[PDB]
Design a protein around this ligand. Structure first.
Ligand SMILES: C[C@H]1O[C@@H](n2cnc3c(N)ncnc32)[C@H](O)[C@@H]1O
Ligand code: SF4
Lengths: 444, 901
């Protein structure tokens, strides 16, 4: 089996930082103020997801339903689907459009027909084709206390922030619109609300040279400010109508050769700690559109082969699973400090074959943060995801048995709380948990 | 979560040999000194300023001495700037403020002076302001006093030359206007600090190996002129004294990067009217030292937090230099005394016995002592757990055997801290400061404080240090407040480490020679051994000899004190046996020795013997019981035997508590011989060992006391997990080989070959008669819970698995007792369990064979078959006569002889 990934795009709109800056990001292609016909921001219209959107005319009930039943004409036999939103700055849209968007995302699985956001998720809880999560990408200045609890009502569990640089000059000179000391503060309120925080990083930006790229990513996992649970490596591509195309035209910006770039990402993956995953090493842009930058579309395996003859194994949690039988497994945990709280990473491992079975995240709720009403009347601890691959069945109930014993004793908590998605709310109701708002919690 | 300690401090005054050879030299001020990587010696220069005279002397580390050059210069009043020794072309060079590159050359075999040439090799017009050599000793970067920077080579011929040009930051009212030069760790870059006015502003410029401008700095305010460079590739590490009023009125240490931008800060907890004179990075990284007027303090960093692990005290500092090749050793000069000091790591922790375990770690963060008992709260290295504050700048810490009493020393004061109980420690109480026992009652003013230790929480041993010798002090801390003295025992050498032994019933130490001695509570010195080389970290315990059956082969039991240490380059010794040769960390335990190998492993040594032989080499398919893979340098921090857990710490700074296989089995084997079977069973499930250790370790104790195992394992969902997942081979002789009573030099037993296609059929070539392990115990399970009437009430579901798990596959007796179940619908709940662990048409043909047709109906509806096929066939069998049916039922199955009867 597995998890079905259905990607939808919202209405093509303008970012909200075009007003007070004067324009959008230097490297961003596409959008309404471009030459691509009827394309969402940061897209070209020639992508296999972005071609299903234009034929659907961005109708969320008809875009998602055509994608779901397409994947079962191939015969994947889907019953657990995780939505992901992309394109634009979805939380910058008007409030009466965003809530009606998410409602028809749920109606394509349940069959309920209505417009109340507070009632559509209740019908979606007893659905049989169920939603395990919704990924919504946004900007770091749109994760305030007003926006983070709107995502809890929508059913969102994972959110993605474009960081793309850890230097102050790069976020200024590329007209990014925020500061790097501001994104390290909104990571803290997001992880204490219970979200899986994934960030985006971009090598080969302007004015960041070859050597500055490797101390950029060494800092990203040594500093306890960031230490997130995921990355999407997006190397810089020069596109036709972008802002950096004129820098390529007048000879004031040149890119990497495709022997030093694959050497770079063979060193970046060497520093990846075992609690984070690398979703993408490059993005799906058809190479006839791109002028300079990445030549081919096979940078993933060319990076794994380049670290074969360096002796270094990429210990990535996207790489280290069954995809070879364990025959045995141990229980280990890892403890790191991330941006205000004590994160732990429980997993079942084999140190010989280097393969993972299950994993879990858990966080002590800090005191400088955590504005939520349910997490203030007493000292609580937040479990953030459970993710078991595939007897080989009781790995879920073992990770919940251990995360609860470690919360009463070592955290000293009176309540444990889950950020389970709507379709998987019934798996926790059997284990003694009860719903209180967005969370599925229990007094210890 | 690791500290720093001082290994050795040896001072001496380099005096310059007068021509008349007596005392009462005029001044002969000490100028500078360097190291020698090719001779294990120290080259220092002496001179005078009134008369233009110089001196240079080489100091080998055996008492010997040589005089290399002694001449006179013109331009009398001046000072020296740089001095380096090549020690391969036996050439000495000099750089003065007056623009002189005076050189000298000696001969290696005839060490007499005055057979030296002196040339000039260049003269700088109008003075030189600063000068510095490269780490590759190939390139000079001197800055002339007329505001002009030049670059030379080894042969002193010029390479290039560059003249310079000229919110905005201010300059504070404490700095002087000199120029500092600092190189990149791998050269071809250097940096030059200077002052411009546009308002007056101090900045710097970054140059290449050639005289080429690359970048300039940001205008930040109050650059105090101190400059350096982290030799890894970044982090210029300036100061920025902040003169802004308010709360933000401290003095920091600010970092840069080579394009001139700002990246990173930390706070240096100092008063504002104090002069920072230097800052120094070590050879590789991870140790920053700032230099005050009379005081040197060292800064380290882990997870972006800086620590003040150590601090040195003197009277008047002039220059501080790190060592090029080996790290954590540095020299300075205090009123003419060159003194070498060398450093190492240490993890001040508590006991390791199974009672009083509560594994406690103690780290130093400047003016506080941070605590983390990893058996109560598994706090990551950035945060901590119930610290306590001190009126001092703690140098070293130690805890007691009940780890309720905490000692932390400072300069000229010694401070105790206590806890009422270990469970009221957990409720939220920080340790309370009790008494501040000064440094005037047990020693004079002339002694110093380095280390401290405990013994059975009643006597506090304190490592003192004299300038020539070293002695330790004993104290009495019964009635903790108002302590009293015990006699000041003394030993005639220089102590390197001081530490309490395992069980905390004695103290051990180590001199410079490697001699390890043992000291009791009333001061009786007992020598243990002498290591072949100087070990920087060691542990001591009294191992015991224990045979197989615990008092068998019993004649003249014995014991011997064994020392366990790792030297600098990585040789693990155990009374001059050289166990391994690449070790980087260790920690001992009762019944186990633990150490990491720097081939990215973590291997174990038992401690029930006394013979020690060198270890068999580990190879890529080891899989014994004693090797587990480590990532890229995770080291030991603590061992918790009462939880069977080992905590580690990686390079990036997290923790990782692995649960090693050698000690998880070491506790479940203790419980099943203690006949517990319930504390043993829970550990068998959470750690996911093969679940049949309960039988395959005591195969005759299991069947003999099997009724206890059913009563103690009172749940139905676990007994169905025991019987179902049984193998056919023995796990004690294949995987869990029990390598305890097995020696030391036994080779690591590799994994078996993959059983390929011809070996699969040759594995099941010998099928299973009435002697296999499965049919022995599956009968034995049925032997007890088919006797009582109440055992087949609660545990009726595990009877279904006990039959259906056999090699004869006795399904006919499972499907017989289902038909007698008359109370409720439990025929439905049992057949849906029997058709999961077996194919349904296999169950359907067996339910059809015991001649009852109403039972075969319920099996067929679970079988995804077409109901138009079997249901008409079941209808013809219903209405006939019974003997008419038993012929019709056997033609379907293939029981032709049974049909014919
Ligand atoms: C919306 C996402 O698209 C990525 N993104 C935006 N522009 C580019 C480009 N030229 N190349 C690669 N990735 C890009 C951003 O980093 C953001 O994470
Ligand atoms: S990058 Fe994100 S924000 Fe900047 S323009 Fe492209 S999409 Fe809009």
């Amino acid at each position: 089996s597995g998890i079905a990934v259905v990607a939808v795009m919202c209405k093509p709109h303008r970012c909200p930082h075009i007003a007070y800056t004067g324009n959008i990001c230097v490297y961003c292609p596409g959008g309404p103020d471009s030459d691509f016909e009827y394309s969402t921001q940061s897209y070209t219209g020639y992508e296999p997801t972005s071609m299903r959107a234009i034929r659907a005319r961005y109708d969320p009930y008809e875009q998602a339903r055509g994608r779901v039943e397409q994947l079962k004409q191939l015969g994947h036999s889907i019953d657990k689907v995780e939505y992901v939103l992309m394109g634009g700055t979805f939380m910058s849209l008007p409030k009466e459009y965003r809530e009606d968007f998410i409602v028809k995302l749920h109606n394509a699985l349940s069959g309920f027909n209505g417009n109340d956001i507070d009632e559509a998720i209740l019908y979606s809880q007893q659905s049989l084709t169920k939603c395990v999560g919704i990924t919504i990408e946004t900007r770091p200045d749109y994760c305030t206390q007003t926006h983070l609890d709107d995502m809890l009502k929508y059913g969102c569990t994972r959110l993605e922030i474009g960081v793309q640089s850890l230097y102050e000059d790069v976020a200024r000179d590329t007209n990014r619109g925020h500061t790097v000391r501001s994104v390290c503060e909104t990571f803290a309120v997001s992880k204490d609300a219970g979200y899986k925080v994934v960030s985006h990083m971009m090598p080969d930006l302007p004015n960041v040279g070859m050597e500055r790229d490797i101390e950029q990513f060494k800092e990203y996992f040594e500093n306890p400010d960031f230490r997130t649970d995921g990355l999407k490596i997006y190397p810089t591509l020069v596109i036709r109508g972008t802002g950096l195309y004129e820098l390529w035209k007048t000879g004031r910006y040149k890119s990497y050769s495709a022997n030093a770039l694959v050497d770079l990402v063979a060193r970046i993956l060497a520093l990846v700690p075992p609690w984070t995953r690398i979703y993408r090493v490059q993005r799906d842009i058809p190479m006839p559109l791109v002028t300079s930058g990445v030549d081919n579309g096979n940078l993933r395996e060319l990076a794994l082969a380049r670290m074969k003859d360096l002796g270094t194994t990429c210990r990535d949690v996207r790489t280290r699973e069954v995809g070879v039988q364990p025959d045995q497994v141990e229980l280990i945990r890892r403890d790191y400090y991330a941006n205000g709280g004590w994160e732990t990473f429980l997993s079942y491992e084999d140190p010989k074959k280097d393969i993972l079975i299950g994993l879990l995240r858990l966080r002590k709720a800090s005191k400088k943060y955590t504005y939520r009403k349910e997490f203030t009347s007493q000292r609580t601890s937040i479990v953030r995801e459970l993710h078991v691959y595939g007897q080989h069945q009781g790995f879920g109930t073992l990770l919940m048995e251990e995360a609860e014993r470690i919360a009463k004793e070592e955290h000293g908590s009176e309540k444990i709380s889950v950020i389970s998605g709507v379709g998987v709310r019934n798996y926790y109701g059997k284990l003694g948990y009860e719903l209180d708002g967005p969370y599925m919690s229990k007094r210890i | 979560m690791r500290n720093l300690i001082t290994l050795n401090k040896g001072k001496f005054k380099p005096t310059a040999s007068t021509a008349e050879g007596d005392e009462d030299d005029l001044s002969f001020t000490l100028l500078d000194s360097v190291f020698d990587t090719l001779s294990d010696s120290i080259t220092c220069v002496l001179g005078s300023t009134d008369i233009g005279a110089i001196e240079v002397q080489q100091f080998m580390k055996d008492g010997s001495r040589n005089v290399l050059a002694s001449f006179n210069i013109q331009t009398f009043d001046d000072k020296l700037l740089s001095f380096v020794h090549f020690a391969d072309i036996n050439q000495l060079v000099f750089v003065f403020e007056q623009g002189d590159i005076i050189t000298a050359t000696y001969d290696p075999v005839s060490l007499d002076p005055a057979e030296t040439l002196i040339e000039i090799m260049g003269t700088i017009d109008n003075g030189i302001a600063a000068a510095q050599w490269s780490y590759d000793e190939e390139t000079l970067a001197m800055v002339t006093k007329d505001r002009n920077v030049v670059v030379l080579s080894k042969l002193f011929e010029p390479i290039s030359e560059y003249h310079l040009e000229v919110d905005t930051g201010d300059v504070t009212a404490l700095d002087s206007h000199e120029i500092t030069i600092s190189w990149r760790g791998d050269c071809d870059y250097f940096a030059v600090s200077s002052v411009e006015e546009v308002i007056k502003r101090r900045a710097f410029r970054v140059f290449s190996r050639e005289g080429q401008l690359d970048s300039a700095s940001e205008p930040v305010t109050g650059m105090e002129h101190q400059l350096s460079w982290k030799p890894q590739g970044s982090l210029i590490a300036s100061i920025q004294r902040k003169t802004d009023l308010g709360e933000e009125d401290s003095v920091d240490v600010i970092f840069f990067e080579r394009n001139g931008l700002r990246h990173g800060e930390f706070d240096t907890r100092l008063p504002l009217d104090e002069k920072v004179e230097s800052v120094c990075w070590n050879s590789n990284s991870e140790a920053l030292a700032v230099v005050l007027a009379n005081r040197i303090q060292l800064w380290t960093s882990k997870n972006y937090h800086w620590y003040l692990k150590q601090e040195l005290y003197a009277s008047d500092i002039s220059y501080v230099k790190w060592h090029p090749e080996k790290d954590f050793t540095l020299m300075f000069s205090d009123a003419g005394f060159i003194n070498i000091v060398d450093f190492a790591y240490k993890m001040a922790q508590g006991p390791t016995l199974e009672p009083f375990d509560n594994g406690t770690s103690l780290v130093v963060d400047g003016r506080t002592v941070n605590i983390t008992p990893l058996a109560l709260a598994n706090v990551p290295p950035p945060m901590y757990y119930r610290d306590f504050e001190t009126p001092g700048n703690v140098l070293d810490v130690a805890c007691s055997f009940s780890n309720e009493i905490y000692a932390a020393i400072n300069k000229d004061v010694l401070i105790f801290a206590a806890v009422p109980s270990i469970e009221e420690m957990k409720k939220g109480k920080h340790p309370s400061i009790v008494c501040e026992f000064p440094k005037s009652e047990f020693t004079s003013e002339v002694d110093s404080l380095r280390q401290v230790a405990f013994i059975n929480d009643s006597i506090v041993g304190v490592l003192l240090d004299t300038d020539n010798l070293s002695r330790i002090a004993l104290l009495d801390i019964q009635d903790i407040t108002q302590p009293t003295l015990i006699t000041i025992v003394e030993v005639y050498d220089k102590i390197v480490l001081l530490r309490s032994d395992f069980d905390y019933n004695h103290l051990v130490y180590e001199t410079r020679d490697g001699t390890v001695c043992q000291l009791d509570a009333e001061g009786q010195l007992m020598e243990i051994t002498k290591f072949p080389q100087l070990v920087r970290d060691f542990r001591v315990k009294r191992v015991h000899n224990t045979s197989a059956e615990d008092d068998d082969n019993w004649s003249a039991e014995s014991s011997e004190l064994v020392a366990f240490g790792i030297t600098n380059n990585g040789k693990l010794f155990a009374n001059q046996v050289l166990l391994a040769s690449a070790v980087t960390s260790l920690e001992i335990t009762d019944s186990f020795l633990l150490f990491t190998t720097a081939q990215h492993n973590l291997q174990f040594v038992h401690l029930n013997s006394t013979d020690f032989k060198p270890l068999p080499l580990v190879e890529e398919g080891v899989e014994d019981e004693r090797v587990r893979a480590i990532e890229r340098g995770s080291i030991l921090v603590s061992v918790i035997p009462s939880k069977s857990s080992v905590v580690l710490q990686a390079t990036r700074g997290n923790l990782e508590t692995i649960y090693p296989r050698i000690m998880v089995l070491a506790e479940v084997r203790k419980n099943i011989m203690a006949k517990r079977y319930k504390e043993a069973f829970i550990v068998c499930r959470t750690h996911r060992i093969n679940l049949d250790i309960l039988h395959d370790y005591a195969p005759e104790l299991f069947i003999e006391n099997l009724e206890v195992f059913i009563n103690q394992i009172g749940r139905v969902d676990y007994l169905n997990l025991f019987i179902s997942c049984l193998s056919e081979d023995d796990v004690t002789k294949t995987k869990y080989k029990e390598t305890l009573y097995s020696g030391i030099s036994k080779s690591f037993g590799m994994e078996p070959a993959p059983l390929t296609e011809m070996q699969i059929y040759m594995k099941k070539k010998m099928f299973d008669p009435k002697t296999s392990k499965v049919n022995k115990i599956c009968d034995a399970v049925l032997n007890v819970l088919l006797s009582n009437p109440e055992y087949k009430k609660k545990y009726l579901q595990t009877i279904i698995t006990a039959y259906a798990s056999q090699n004869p596959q006795n399904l006919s007796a499972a499907l017989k007792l289902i038909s007698e179940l008359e109370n409720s619908e439990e025929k439905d709940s049992c057949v849906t369990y029997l058709c999961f662990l077996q194919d349904v048409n296999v169950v359907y043909k067996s339910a059809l064979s015991l001649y009852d047709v109403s039972l075969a109906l319920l099996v067929a509806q679970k079988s995804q078959m077409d109901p138009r096929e079997y249901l008409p066939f079941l209808q013809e069998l219903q209405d006939n006569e019974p003997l008419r049916r038993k012929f019709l039922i056997d033609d379907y199955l293939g029981n032709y002889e049974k049909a014919l009867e």
